[PDB]
């Protein structure tokens, strides 16, 4: 059907049509006549999957010749989504499985909504691991994702009486055809126990065992014949056992596996999460220096390997390289610390002090106590640094310490991570200059060559192609198709923005989406949407940083000013607002009540008409996101400046299309900066404007007293105006709004509202908004992936990627 | 290499070696030069199953044209063993595979060796069920086989210091080729709750839900084209969820399938079990049902439909199948008792009153409230007969209850099981007529025509051909391959007992098999037996009734009567004892002690030499007996006269080449009744003896004094002589062997022994032995299952058996 999608083929269509049968007959053991839906989704899934299978073995038998330098992707989160259609694309199959699959009468799409998500991750940091691994194996990089194979993902959102309930994902429940069990690789990890010191050194034991077997998930890379290895973890209880008690209690291993902690930028000091943390961490370096004995003096050991730690939750990976050097190996200390340092590297995600892994001393005490007497060591042996190189600074000294002092002594993750590791990078420039400006002032300046930056980028695989065909196309029929592998080509478009032709085309294809989108509402959740009105959508999880709040007055004072003037003229809106909040963040299920209260209001007044609209997007997910996204016309970004770290959504809009307003905070600031600021709608309080209100104190009844309409919404909230049979169903909300708001949602309200009536004239004008449009668009390019992985393996891993085609 | 084991063909042969070679590379991910021999397996698994999956499809194609009665076998377990041989026997392709894996270099015996035994039973009652699939599926009966799929089997068991140590069976690790799931048949079932009374009748409410999750498995008829169906349901918790905890406490629903119980004709009123037979019950008649339903009035339901309880462990299947026709489809009470009674029927498997299902009312009570107040109206109607018929016999009354009273008001299952089906059978001609005699006599009394024999068998498929395809090879040479099907042309062999060549060949097949087993000792569990002795072995599960007390004294008496003329000569012997202890069962596990114990004294005794050998058959199981049975020479069968109801291990010695010395119980009288009592080692108290023993009283003292060996062999026990570092470690056995012994040992001591030696004086004379053998051989044609099925069908299901080949 269209040319970005692969040729048909004869030879290759009859070839995929009698494998689907092979499989639906001899896999699934059916035939036509009792088939369900869901087995043709799988007989098509194993015919992909086979395409696979030649290039999978000859990838990893190619390293094992050559022996390249290894990237190891440590992460406990891989938000993966669907990857039928993302392995036909990467392989060029789509329109060949599209013919084959029409031919034998049925239709793929109806077959790809069929697969489940892999929804292990909670948000931005699972999905930039999931996007990572595409464009390592893109880039032709020797690359391993390590993580863990949880049973169940993030939960299932769904919305009764306006409250979110939480559904457990048994996203396994009817099988995965994409992972491979490898039983020959289980490996042991251990917890629990005591230290004994000996003549040859520290010895743990007495410790229980958990073993943990390996599941491969093939990653293709984009048609370069590269299929690189996802290897995800699974807890498992050794063998060796009143009776039927003791085979029921093998469950309790097995939990270590059982569920994703549902927890975006926020810390529990759970044992069951730390557990998870060192489970992967031990198990997938034991697989890493296995393959590494098999290329005894480790000062190879850092060319032949790199390890990315995404944040800190495999921070243990740092202690456990020790132990097993120092401890099994018997290499000295000092030879030991300096191979950890040059192999590890660590990526920060966040500066709020919520999210800020520290764990109490009694916790690793019982369940790590070597590892814990190692990070002493390395303490000790860090401060005697800081000590030497600023005498006297025993405040310094405090700060510094890995080790924190109080009522309950904890470790600082973070501080473990810079100490072990040769390089620290932010995810983008406004962060990564804020680590070195505050959070990790005191280690900067010990160590300034340590810091890096690494802005976030998405794949223009998923996040265009599969999701985006139509742009895709259009875009191609102008420039060619080698943008999407190198994408900073979409400059080229800059020169077709008086192009009559292709300002019809992409205004064109964005009413298609919105048009597609706007039935999907009616058909699985019986909407009204008016797809001629601006799509005004806001996803991302609920958190009160990202200020879904500040969204929620806008759409306040629009209701309030139509109920003010019926009869005056606006620019229609249908604003949608989706994302999960965490189970127990009371201040997050509150939020979302509040939004799914104002569209009960603001849908159901006469007066309004179609003219506003406030809808609640449902379990907000990977999936989900490939479909509003592309069929988006504002990107809502507007935390509070300084606390989204970067932010990937925004980039997943902006290369689909839709216009920005934000403040100057993560990505955003390097994204106006490409696209011209004027291509952007910009508001709101600066970082340094945020640093003097908190110098003289953030006071939010002088906005209240000040601003008449905000006064009025306030009004309406504490009166019961949104919640009619419980009057006082908000008063948390207008509580922590007028006395206790970490995040200044009155400060940025003015300039907000008025921001937002600039969009809404420019809206009026179809040709400069699309005009607007393509200017973003063709800037884009810069948050690729490709071009963030090239970074790390340039200035960090050491390697050179390569685009160079691996033979069919 | 032999006839009866398939042609191999050019074409046949290349047909398998590319598609083990696509499996290995697609389905298994691998090349030759990584492939581990489980990854063999596995192809060479899959290769197999391929050529089951249209055979499969036609089968349950043509079932649902022809629309025939359907039989439904309700299981708690199905001791299956292994599957890839049994599945190339029954499909001929055994010689095919074994060339076609000769030509790709690899050894097939050592592939199979590989598979997991699929241990989901105990013993007897196990493989009763295990043999009728296949002879179901051999004589085209549309049978399905329906139970719980345990993630852990029976236990595996390992001697440590001569005890029995437990571990975990888990038998799924590595993945079950043969197991289709099937998702979409997922049904729930309903637990606790409690009963409301409405104007439409009685309504179970308020309940908890357990969702049963079907795997299919594939049984193959012999050479008939015929693949009928085993469907083992799998506990699954619902979706519809503090949070972590949620979703870790599903756990607990899916617990219903996780193991199961271990005991050997033993009754444990734990709750766990019982939901266990409530859950298997609920699933597979919502399943029958619905079959039922697409073929509404249920007066043609028992024409369709015939549901074989095998024991009383599905028992709540009569109340279950009431409680739908009355609550859900509105019945009334006698119409739908009428049906009940007409599509059940059960098969009792003992006698011994510690096997007899007794639950609790107040458990009943809690669980299934409903089914409660089904059983007390069952009751009442059932005592009200009970009381027409017998006016006045008020005890009457109180034995035929299903209620028992007393500090613990109980249900009796059997008086359930009774009550409910329209046939009851036992599995011997002696135990059934017990049955009519004693423990049922009131309700054979009430109802006479119920009552039925259906003696046992075994598979001659799996026991001789699969296990001793040497001894298969030379009665084909002389009769032909259609006895495989039709054992009774095993008569024929008679007819030969006279020829020099079939002596030789029958000879070397067995000394074959023994060489062949006693090097299997060496291997894997380094031992030293000669191969030139009487090969003497009693492998069933340790109980006290099956007497290996009784066979361990023997050993005893031969060790001293050694000691007293060390230089004269007796016929020597390899002592072979295994089985497994059920777990908490004390005394069973002091008897695996004893055994390992004397082993000890008499394997280390340089005056014995290689004369007499004691060794304990660790871990026995199906695939193990498939190794022992073929290598014995004597079948040791000596369970106290009245109490093994039939035994099938008997049979399956005596179809294999081993002569029997054994007790008048059980099936052993219908065996030596078809050999000739001349043919086979009977002794010990017939029934009546151990009758006018108990009236007189069994003084165990009075033996002891009467017989010096004896005396002797107790005092040994009681010194220490054989635990040296703990004297009185057999306290307990020689307290209950003296003062609490119900089963009689010493009484049949005397008449044992002196049996014994008749049977050396037998082997000194090979060919007269051997000839023996062969009117064994030649009269075990009865004992096959083949039989046994069919007088099922004919006597009780109403459907008549064929061998018409399917279609290919
Ligand atoms: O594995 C090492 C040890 O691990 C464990 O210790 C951890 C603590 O439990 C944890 O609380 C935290 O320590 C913090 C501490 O609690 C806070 O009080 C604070 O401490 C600062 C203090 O307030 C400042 O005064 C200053 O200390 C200076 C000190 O006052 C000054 O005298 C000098 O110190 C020199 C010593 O005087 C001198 O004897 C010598 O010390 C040798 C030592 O003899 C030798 O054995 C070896 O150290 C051994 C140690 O002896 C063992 O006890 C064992 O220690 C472990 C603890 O038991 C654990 O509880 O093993 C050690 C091996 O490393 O080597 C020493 C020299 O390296 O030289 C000293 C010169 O440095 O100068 C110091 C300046 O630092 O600073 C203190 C730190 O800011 O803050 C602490 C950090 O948060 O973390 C501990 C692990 O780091
Ligand atoms: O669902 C039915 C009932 O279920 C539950 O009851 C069970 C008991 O809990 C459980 O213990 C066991 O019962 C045993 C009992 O505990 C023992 O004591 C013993 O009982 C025997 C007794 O010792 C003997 O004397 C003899 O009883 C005779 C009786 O003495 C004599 O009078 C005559 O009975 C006639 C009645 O007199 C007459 O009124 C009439 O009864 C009608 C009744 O009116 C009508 O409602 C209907 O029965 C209802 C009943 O009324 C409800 O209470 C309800 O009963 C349930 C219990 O509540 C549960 O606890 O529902 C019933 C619907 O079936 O119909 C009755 C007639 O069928 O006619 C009677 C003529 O039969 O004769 C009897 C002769 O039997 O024998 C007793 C039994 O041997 O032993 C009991 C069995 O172990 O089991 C109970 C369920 O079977
Ligand atoms: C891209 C993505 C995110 C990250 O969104 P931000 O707005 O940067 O937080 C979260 N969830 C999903 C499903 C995503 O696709
Ligand atoms: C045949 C068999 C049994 C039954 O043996 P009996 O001696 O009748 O109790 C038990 N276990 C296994 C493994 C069997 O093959």
Redesign the interface.
């Known amino acids: 059907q269209i040319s970005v999608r692969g040729l048909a083929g004869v030879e290759n269509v009859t070839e995929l049509k009698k494998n689907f049968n092979r499989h639906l007959?001899?896999t699934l053991?059916?035939?036509r006549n009792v088939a369900?839906p869901?087995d043709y989704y799988f007989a098509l899934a194993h015919t992909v999957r086979?395409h696979l299978?030649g290039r999978?073995?000859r990838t990893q038998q190619h390293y094992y010749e050559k022996d390249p330098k290894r990237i190891y992707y440590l992460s406990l989160e891989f938000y993966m989504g669907r990857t039928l259609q993302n392995t036909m694309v990467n392989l060029a199959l789509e329109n060949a499985c599209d013919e084959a699959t029409y031919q034998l009468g049925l239709d793929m799409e109806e077959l790809e909504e069929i697969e489940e998500d892999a929804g292990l991750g909670n948000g931005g940091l699972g999905r930039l691991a999931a996007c990572f691994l595409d464009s390592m194996a893109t880039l032709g990089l020797a690359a391993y994702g390590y993580g863990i194979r949880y049973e169940?993902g993030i939960?299932?959102q769904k919305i009764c009486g306006g409250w979110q309930?939480?559904?457990?994902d048994?996203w396994l429940?009817?099988?995965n055809p994409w992972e491979?069990?490898r039983?020959?690789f289980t490996l042991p990890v251990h917890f629990y126990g005591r230290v004994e010191h000996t003549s040859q050194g520290a010895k743990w034991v007495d410790t229980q065992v958990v073993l943990a077997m390996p599941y491969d998930t093939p990653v293709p890379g984009y048609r370069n014949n590269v299929v690189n290895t996802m290897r995800l973890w699974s807890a498992?209880?050794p063998?060796?056992?009143?009776?039927?008690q003791?085979?029921?209690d093998?469950?309790l291993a097995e939990?270590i596996s059982?569920?994703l902690?549902?927890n975006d930028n926020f810390f529990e000091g759970?044992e069951?999460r730390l557990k998870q943390e060192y489970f992967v961490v031990a198990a997938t370096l034991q697989d890493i220096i296995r393959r590494f004995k098999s290329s005894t003096n480790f000062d190879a050991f850092p060319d032949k390997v790199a390890i990315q730690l995404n944040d800190t939750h495999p921070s243990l990976a740092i202690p456990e390289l020790m132990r097993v050097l120092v401890d099994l190996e018997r290499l000295d200390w000092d030879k030991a610390w300096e191979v950890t340092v040059k192999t590890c590297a660590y990526t920060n995600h966040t500066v709020i002090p919520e999210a800020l892994e520290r764990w109490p001393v009694h916790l690793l005490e019982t369940l790590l106590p070597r590892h814990l007497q190692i990070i002493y060591e390395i303490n000790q042996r860090f401060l005697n640094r800081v000590a030497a190189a600023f005498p006297g600074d025993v405040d310094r000294l405090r700060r510094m310490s890995l080790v924190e002092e109080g009522a309950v002594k904890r470790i600082n993750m973070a501080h473990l991570c810079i100490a072990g590791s040769h390089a620290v990078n932010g995810v983008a420039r406004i962060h990564s200059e804020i680590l070195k400006k505050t959070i990790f002032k005191d280690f900067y300046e010990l160590e300034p060559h340590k810091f890096q930056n690494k802005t976030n980028g998405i794949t223009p695989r998923r996040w265009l192609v599969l999701c985006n065909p139509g742009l895709a196309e259009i875009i191609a029929e102008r420039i060619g198709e080698e943008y999407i592998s190198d994408l900073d080509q979409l400059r080229k478009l800059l020169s077709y923005v008086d192009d009559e032709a292709f300002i019809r085309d992409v205004a064109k294809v964005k009413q298609e989406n919105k048009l597609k989108f706007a039935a999907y509402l009616e058909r699985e959740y019986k909407v009204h949407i008016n797809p001629n009105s601006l799509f005004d959508v806001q996803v991302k999880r609920i958190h009160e940083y990202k200020r879904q709040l500040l969204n929620c007055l806008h759409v306040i004072t629009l209701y309030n000013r139509i109920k003010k003037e019926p009869n005056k003229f606006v620019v229609p809106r249908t604003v949608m607002i989706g994302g999960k909040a965490a189970?127990?963040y009371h201040m997050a299920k509150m939020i979302i009540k509040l939004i799914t209260a104002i569209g009960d209001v603001v849908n159901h007044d006469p007066v309004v008409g179609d003219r506003l609209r406030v809808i609640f997007l449902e379990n907000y997910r990977v999936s989900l996101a490939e479909k509003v996204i592309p069929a988006a016309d504002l990107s809502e970004q507007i935390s509070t400046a300084g606390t989204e770290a970067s932010g990937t959504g925004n980039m997943k809009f902006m290369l689909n299309g839709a216009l920005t307003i934000g403040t100057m905070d993560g990505a955003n600031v390097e994204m106006a900066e490409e696209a011209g600021e004027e291509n952007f709608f910009i508001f709101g309080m600066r970082v340094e404007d945020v640093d003097r209100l908190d110098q003289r104190g953030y006071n939010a009844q002088e906005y209240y007293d000040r601003i008449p309409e905000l006064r009025q919404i306030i009004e309406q909230l504490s009166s019961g105006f949104f919640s009619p049979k419980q009057p006082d169903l908000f008063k948390d909300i207008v509580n922590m709004l007028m006395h206790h708001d970490r995040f200044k949602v009155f400060a940025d309200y003015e300039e907000y509202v008025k921001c937002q009536e600039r969009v809404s004239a420019l809206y009026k004008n179809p040709r400069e908004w699309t005009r607007m449009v393509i200017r973003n668009i063709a800037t884009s390019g810069k948050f690729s992936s490709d071009r963030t992985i090239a970074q790390y393996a340039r200035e960090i891993w050491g390697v050179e990627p390569s685009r160079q085609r691996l033979p069919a």
Chains 1, 2 share one sequence.
Request: charged share 30%; no cysteine.
């Open positions: 007959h001899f053991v059916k035939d369900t869901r086979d299978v999978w073995i169940f939960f299932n309930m939480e559904e457990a048994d429940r009817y099988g491979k069990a039983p020959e498992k209880a063998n060796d056992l009143g009776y039927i003791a085979v029921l093998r469950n939990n059982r569920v902690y549902p759970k069951l189970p127990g």
